[PDB]
């Protein structure tokens, strides 16, 4: 399955994921594509901030959904 | 004038911080002139650096704003003297006081760390060739941080 | 009635606000030297107002903020030649009496409002129909 | 005519050589600013506060300027570290020559050593000895 | 009578009527003991082409005391320091009253042609005269071109 | 009636003829920097006229041609000392009023004729028998 | 009065300018033109804007126009003082030639330098000896004098 | 035979030539000694401008005459 | 036997000597320890300037006496 996360600069990046994957995994999976270390990333979806420990299925993130990436200053 | 500002100013004058001079402006009590001596065993040794400190109207809810006025070669200070340190930004807490801000800037002078870089240009050279960075900082020390008075 | 913000921190506010272009776009300002820790020498620019002899002529200026800024007004000087009441034609220096914001200076004012005032006075009717020199001419010095 | 005059530069090298070799108490001290300036115009001076005064044991730094007419004309003197004193301007630090006798009544036998010693003697004047003195470590601009 | 000691008058007169080749020297109209001197850089020397200003003062005890001489044109030389002071044996302990001004000037002119770094004045200049003499002469030529082009 | 030659092309004419020895040889002129594209600072030289106290003394001067050359006259300054009416004796600068070609400047004139009239003025009876300083003496500055 | 050739050439040059070249009369001398030539692409002078002067002498079009650079430039056919070595500005001038064609020839000279005729001998020899270093030196000079001088 | 051409500078160059030689040949052979490009040269003799196609004997140029060399005034 | 040489710089050096030794010999032995060439040295003892030709015993310089070293400037 593929999902998209948009940073607030205005870019969209596409990742192939599995619902099994944890959010720490997708953060590493963003880092591999954009070089942004996972410690500076914050992922938000459907009015909720995602925790590193839980999974995509925990938040009910289904096929080609879109999350938003806020960068920590 | 907030009741905290008078009591903090008085204790900064009664017990000054070793290696740091700081006093209010006689025309602005929220405005302080600061002098920080270059810490020992560091590339800035021998130098004396001028800084400005201002306590904004919402202090202590807003952080004090301070900046260097002697140009200095350091990864956390830019061309115009602005300082990058969390305690002056997102990790400011109203329970912190001026004494600890000044002490933290002094400590930053002895432990420069370029992983979070303000002026990335000096910081990436502090990583690439730290030795020449240290001696460039020594040269800048002799240029701008001596002949101060 | 509240207390004043010292010169250099106010100039760093104005410097950061000059770089993130919020607002009209008729005015723009920044440091001349970019590394000048005095924060004294600024460059300003005004785009000519429509419906005037100034229209879409881009004027660049030199603004100097003194030791008493922003309690005292800054000196302003045109470098692109221009005919304007209050604007000397041998120097380009601005007559403070000619500009209300400079004749009646208040510390609530900024460099943005000085430049926006000069553009509004370019839309003033004693100036909009003045004869202007050919574009590209500037005084020297 | 009653004596020989020593031209400027030889006298200034005389004063420099004695400024570096332990002349007198040490309450006054002087030397060249540039050390490589062949003009010999710009000098640095220093005064130790006189006993029994509000100036006492405060080290004062000064700038002495010897013009093309030295020592037939008096030198310009200016305090750089702030001080409260009659004749010393408080925004600039420049010294009023008229207020200083050796500058008001200049004679070519005088030296910058004697000018500094006169400023220190004038720190012991009773109009000067008990003035309020500014906090130590403060200096004028320029 | 005579304004000052007659030796000073007769030496001044012989120095103006029969000047030393390569050296111009004349009294100041306001001090008869004070002489303005110009020495041209001798050929076969790094200072060739340059004109060097010097001062000479006849102290009150002259001729029992030696004349005082110093450069006012900056010069790269083992026997001249930052301020133009000259280390020359005859101007110090080896002065004798029978010596004349003309020969003091001649010995300084010769000093310009035969620098010898055994004297320890201007220590860095002398030890680089011993270190890389080629670079020392090219430095002296450079300084000649720097300070002696537009002096007179 | 005639056409005006702008500053730089006229100065390149004067530069070329200063290097190809046209005429007397009593005067000579050229660029100071040789690489100065402004073409502002010139060096001039006058040979003393026979039958004068100036005779066979080489005088060197500094001539500066301003932005309005040759519609405006050039500034002239002696560097080798000289006793002459119109020439200040502490500085060496030339008083324009005392010299006709500078007091009545005409755009047909060049720095060549400025030097040639200064040499003509050395044979004037008010200048020709003046006491001159020893050869080799010069002002500073 | 002014020759009808100079007027018609001035008019045709202002109504239809040469691409990459600005040229306009001086308001106080109609025989005097201020010219700006943009550094041609794919040449060391790209990015730079080069100031030139052009004067139509009293004998024009029988005599060639006089042209010189006012921006310092590293080029085998331009010397220290901005003078240009170009055949049509000298012995191979013909009265039928026009100002616009002179400007085109200078613009083309900027992209096709030829050190076969050396007005500035040092630059022409550097160009023939080490063309790479000559081109990078000219690029450096472009960045020095032909930028931030507009 | 040897002949010389005097330039406008005042220099004289002498080359041995033969009556067989064309004026194009004389131009190329002065270039061989002093490097002045042949097309920039114009030769004048006895009130006549010499053209490249003809020979010295056509112009009645005999032993040790002098030609004058006019250069086209190429600015630089 | 040992003797001392005191310069006016303020340092004292000790030399092991014999009464047979000439002042020339003592000068060479101070040169070996202080690098000062003997022609720049002048030795003084008991109000007398020591000459190179004579010996320590000529001057009655006995054990652990002190000579004074003056350096000549030229």
Numbering used by the authors:
A (entry chain F): 1 to 73
B (entry chain D): 4 to 152
C (entry chain E), F (entry chain B): 5 to 145
D (entry chain H): 4 to 145
E (entry chain G): 1 to 152
G (entry chain A): 3 to 152
H (entry chain C): 1 to 76
I (entry chain I): 1 to 74
Source paper text:
Ubiquitin chains that are linked via lysine 63 (K63) are involved in endocytosis, DNA damage, and the immune response. The only E2 enzyme dedicated to K63-ubiquitination is Ube2N (Ubc13), which forms a heterodimer with either Ube2V2 (Mms2) or Ube2V1 (Uev1). Ube2V2 binds and orients the acceptor ubiquitin, thereby generating specificity for K63 linkage. TRIM21 detects antibody-coated viruses by specifically recognizing the bound antibody.
We gained additional insight into how Ube2V2 positions the acceptor ubiquitin by analyzing a Ube2N~Ub:Ube2V2 complex that we solved at 2.5 Å resolution. By invoking crystal symmetry, this structure shows the orientation of an acceptor ubiquitin by Ube2V2, so that its K63 is pointed toward the active site of Ube2N, an orientation comparable with a structure of yeast Ube2N~Ub:Ube2V2 that was solved in a different crystal lattice. Without a RING present, the donor ubiquitin is not in the closed conformation and our Ube2N~Ub:Ube2V2 structure thus represents an inactive complex. Alignment to our Ub-R:Ube2N~Ub:Ube2V2 structure reveals that Ube2N and Ube2V2 are packed more closely against each other, resulting in additional contacts between the acceptor ubiquitin and Ube2N, that position the nucleophile K63 much nearer to the active site (4.8 vs. 7.5 Å). This is achieved because Ube2N N123 and D124 contact ubiquitin via the amide of ubiquitin K63 and the sidechains of S57 and Q62, respectively.
